[PDB]
RNA sequence: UUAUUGGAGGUAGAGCACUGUUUGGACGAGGGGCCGGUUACCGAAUUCAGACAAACUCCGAAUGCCAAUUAAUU
RNA sequence: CUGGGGCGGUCGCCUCCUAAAAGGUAACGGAGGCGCUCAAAGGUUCCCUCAGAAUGGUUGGAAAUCAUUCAUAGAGUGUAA
RNA sequence: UCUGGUGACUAUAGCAAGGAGGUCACACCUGUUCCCAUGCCGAACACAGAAGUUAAGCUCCUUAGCGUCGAUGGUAGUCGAACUUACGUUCCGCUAGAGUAGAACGUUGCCAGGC
């Protein structure tokens, strides 16, 4: 399980998160052991990919800019209309 | 033939605070207007019969905390 | 099986309530009085009678109306009355077993029972109109219920 | 459930109304009060 | 049918009808239930109408839930009087729905006789509806 | 089970309702006293600025005697008198704690009294 | 009128801690099937999950309001 | 007065919601009260702390009374909110 | 530095659990003769003493078990603007409640005694 990212610079609009959600791009958050917060992004197929292959419970190599770190996922918002992911929350796990 | 059988209020009291945070306040100012104690009178303030919170020297007005859950209105002196 | 660390910590009884009970009196002012007469006899405390807590439905009471009586017996002359009297009401009870194996709320409670039987055992109540059951509370200072009934199993038949 | 007025001997007027039970206090009530004219407490009575 | 056994107030306000479902979202009690997409009420006499005709093609053999209760009166006047002296006399009870709410959930038998039971449900029902499964991932 | 209270937590109480209108201000500071089942102490407070002023105390060198014990409040009023007299020997407010102005605390105040304050 | 600063107040939204309404499932106490008890069934309590409110609230905005500054425009 | 008028209802005062987080705010809009009472149910100084739930126990209407623990006003506060 | 008295602070201070301490304090503790007192009980209050005890209250160390506090990111709602009559859409500011990471088994003033 790898998943690649993309560091979000500061302050998007809420026009900037629709078309970040118009494409297969979701908003996520990385916090917890041995990081500072950081927001990034993330492809919606490849999350999919990977969730449906290490299980709801599992460790991700989350690559976020040079660093990679061993991840799990905390929770996420769904929309259950339209049937897509909207947020996800990543936690370090030392 | 129907009718109704609610149709009466009574007059509006005018509670609530009638002077502000900051504010410059003569001898006996009213501050606040209310049933019960919803605020409290704290340093230099009286409360009154029907609960009224006034002012007892003249000063500047200072609402804040009391305990977890209360408040109070206070006058200080120099201004 | 006592293994006390220090003398201090040594469960003793704290203290004995008898109460006298019911004494609902529509029209038993007399008998009222001739009960807390018996109550000030049986043991050497001012009796203080009670008074209703609350409005029972369908029942003569209201708020007020004394129906009731208690004492409070833990000095030392009062100790001395209880053992006694204990001591006396075991010849009198004619019971095997004497008291019933689980009385204690787990707190040490005795709560135990009377029916004017061996009341009135000194003086025979043949001027009584009615029977004066009671009710014997024994306050134990002690934590463990099994450890109290042990405690209380000591001059005592249960 | 009515109106009681208290009276002064010495002061000379009746200075002071009340009221009153009929019915729990048939009796004539009495109670001390200031007379200025006088200048101290003294004691009046219904009337 | 369904109604509460008592109320504080026999005359209330009519509900807000604009807005998004606030809550039960998501099939929690069976395995397949039946999300609603448009707004409207549902008036106790539809949800009787559209549980017997689910309950008698899956022939007992499942379980069902009524995800939806009308706890709110309406009120309507005698036949056509003027206008205002009080208001009426209560006429109904009804349930608000918005997009997103589950309404029936079944649980017991397979997907295709589940997908026929809710398909038969939804035609007596006053609003637009969408087939869904437990939710994953 | 009988469960006994303790007795210093319920001075407290009572102590802090005594407590809501009797404060010191520096020209009547307060006189605090606290009564222990051996020893009684005193202190001058301005509660404005939360300073103490003065304090004696039966524990104290001393005052070191046997008397039964009620003398010796006595003796730990008068010398707190002259402790308050050296600097502002005026009206102050008596602080009974919580405790029942009888017996020993009244026999504090009474001798705090008949030396030289105005309380 | 705006910037900055301080304050009073319970709407939208949310939530179920109280007062009411409600759907499933447990747990046990009771009546109760029987021959007193099994089981059923029935009602009450505590729990787990999930819902509703103009006259519910452990929470709680955006705005609007009251003020004060050798502030800036008018 | 009045969703024409009549018939029916209503007319002064208090509390709540409508009322859009200051105050104010209508309809024959939605709910209730008042036309008093108290000689202490007023003043002051001292004390004190509940309902309820749980387990026991003669009478036990299940609960009256008694004992222990928990128990934030759920008690109580003359009279509506 | 320890203990005590007395203040200030929204429980980050509380409740629960485990473990240790005493003649320097404090408390349990002895008794009811006296001051005083208990609708009865020296239980409580009050007074008189120091025999015992750290058992308890209390004080110190351990734990995040319940309670309390609590971001970031996202979402709801909404001032203003622009489309529109859709149980609406778009842009720009402000920005919850719930939940997650996490904090937390108090901080501090004055006085006395002991150090």
């Known amino acids: 399980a790898s998943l690649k990212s993309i560091i979000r610079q500061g302050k998007q609009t809420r026009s900037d998160l629709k078309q970040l959600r118009k494409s297969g791009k979701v908003p996520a958050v990385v916090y917890g052991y041995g990081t500072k917060n950081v927001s990034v992004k993330v492809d919606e197929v490849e999350f999919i990919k990977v969730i449906r292959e290490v299980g709801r419970n599992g460790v991700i190599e989350l690559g976020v800019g040079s660093k990679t770190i061993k991840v799990m996922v905390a929770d996420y918002q769904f929309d259950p209309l339209k049937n897509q992911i909207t947020h996800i929350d990543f936690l370090a796990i030392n | 033939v129907s009718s109704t059988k609610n149709g009466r209020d009574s007059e509006s009291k005018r509670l609530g605070a009638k002077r502000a945070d900051g504010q410059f306040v003569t001898g006996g100012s009213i501050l606040y207007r209310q049933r019960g104690t919803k605020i409290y009178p704290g ?14 020297i003249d000063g500047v007005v200072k609402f804040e905390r009391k305990g977890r859950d209360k408040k109070q209105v206070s006058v200080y002196a120099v201004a | 099986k006592f293994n006390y660390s220090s003398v201090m910590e040594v469960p003793k009884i704290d203290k004995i309530v008898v109460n006298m009970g019911v004494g609902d009196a529509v029209q038993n002012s007399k008998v009222l009085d001739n009960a807390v007469e018996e109550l000030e006899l049986i043991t050497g405390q001012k009796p203080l ?110 | 459930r009515v109106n009681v007025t208290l009276a002064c001997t010495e002061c000379g007027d009746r200075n002071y109304i009340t009221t009153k039970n009929k019915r729990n206090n048939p009796e004539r009530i009495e109670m001390k009060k200031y007379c200025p004219r006088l200048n101290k407490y003294t004691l009046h009575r219904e009337t | 049918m369904l109604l509460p056994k008592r109320v504080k107030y026999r005359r209330q306000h009519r509900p807000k009808t604009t807005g998004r479902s ?73 349930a608000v729905v918005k997009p997103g709410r589950i309404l029936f959930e079944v649980a017991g038998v397979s997907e295709e006789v589940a997908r026929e039971a809710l398909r038969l449900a939804s035609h007596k029902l006053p609003v637009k509806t969408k087939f869904v499964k437990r939710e994953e991932l | 089970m009988i469960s006994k209270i303790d007795k210093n937590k319920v001075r407290l109480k009572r102590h802090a309702r005594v407590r809501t209108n009797l404060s010191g201000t520096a020209e009547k500071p307060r006189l605090n006293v606290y009564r222990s089942n051996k020893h009684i102490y005193a202190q001058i407070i301005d509660d404005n600025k939360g300073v103490t002023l003065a304090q004696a105390s039966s524990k104290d060198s001393d005052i070191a005697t046997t008397a039964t014990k009620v003398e010796l409040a006595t003796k730990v009023g008068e010398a707190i008198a002259k402790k308050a007299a050296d600097k502002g020997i005026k009206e102050i407010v008596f602080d009974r704690g919580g405790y029942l102005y009888h017996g020993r605390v009244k026999a504090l105040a009474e001798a705090a009294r008949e030396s030289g304050l105005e309380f």
């Open chain 5, 22 to 94: 606030k809550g039960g979202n998501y099939v929690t009690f069976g395995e397949f239930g039946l999300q609603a997409t448009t707004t409207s009420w549902i008036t106790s006499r539809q949800i009787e109408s559209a549980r017997i005709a689910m309950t008698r093609y899956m022939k007992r053999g499942g379980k069902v839930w009524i995800k939806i209760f009308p706890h709110t009166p309406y009120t309507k006047k005698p036949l056509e009087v003027r206008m205002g002296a009080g208001k009426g006399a209560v006429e109904g009870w009804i």
């Open chain 3, 49 to 158: 009678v009670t008074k209703a807590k609350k409005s029972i439905a369908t029942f003569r009471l209201r708020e007020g109306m004394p129906i009731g009586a208690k004492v409070t017996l833990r000095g030392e002359r009062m100790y001395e009355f209880l053992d006694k009297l204990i001591s006396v009401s075991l010849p009198r009870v004619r019971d095997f077993q004497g008291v019933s194996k689980k009385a204690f709320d787990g707190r040490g409670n005795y709560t135990l029972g009377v029916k004017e039987q061996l009341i009135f055992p000194e003086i025979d109540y043949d001027k009584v109109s009615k029977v004066r059951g009671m009710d014997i509370v024994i306050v134990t200072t002690a934590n463990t219920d099994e450890e109290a009934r042990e405690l209380l199993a000591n001059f005592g038949m249960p």
């Open chain 2, 43 to 56: 340093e230099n303030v009286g409360r009154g019969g029907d609960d009224t919170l006034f002012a007892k």
